[PDB]
């Protein structure tokens, strides 16, 4: 749902790249920090 | 409640500075002007 003072993103659909219809999607707000970090590799565990 | 084209502020709660949970609060929008002015002193009246 909506988050106060936060960015949002839209998902849209195309019919042969001729119709564009958006949908309210992904309200996201964020604080900056060094603790959280996105990792591309899906596997995460006790490994070397 | 929300005000169109206006800033908003969040109130949050902390459990021993370990959990942060915000609440949609104080939608405020404003025009600039010289009439209204915030005064720190609570007492306001006919005084010198």
UniProtKB/Swiss-Prot annotation, chains A, B:
What does the record give as the function of this protein? S1 region attaches the virion to the cell membrane by interacting with host ANPEP/aminopeptidase N, initiating the infection. Binding to the receptor probably induces conformational changes in the S glycoprotein unmasking the fusion peptide of S2 region and activating membranes fusion. S2 region belongs to the class I viral fusion protein. Under the current model, the protein has at least 3 conformational states: pre-fusion native state, pre-hairpin intermediate state, and post-fusion hairpin state.
Task: Provide the assembly information.
Answer: Homotrimer. During virus morphogenesis, found in a complex with M and HE proteins. Interacts with host ANPEP.
Organism of provenance: Human coronavirus 229E
Task: Give the UniProt subcellular location, in the record's own words.
Answer: Virion membrane; Host endoplasmic reticulum-Golgi intermediate compartment membrane
Q: What does changing residue 35 to V do?
A: In strain: Isolate A162
Organism's domain of life?
A: Viruses
Task: State the family it belongs to.
Answer: Belongs to the alphacoronaviruses spike protein family.
Q: What is known of its domains?
A: The KxHxx motif seems to function as an ER retrieval signal.
Can you name this protein?
A: Spike glycoprotein
Residue span relative to the full protein: 390 to 437 of 1173
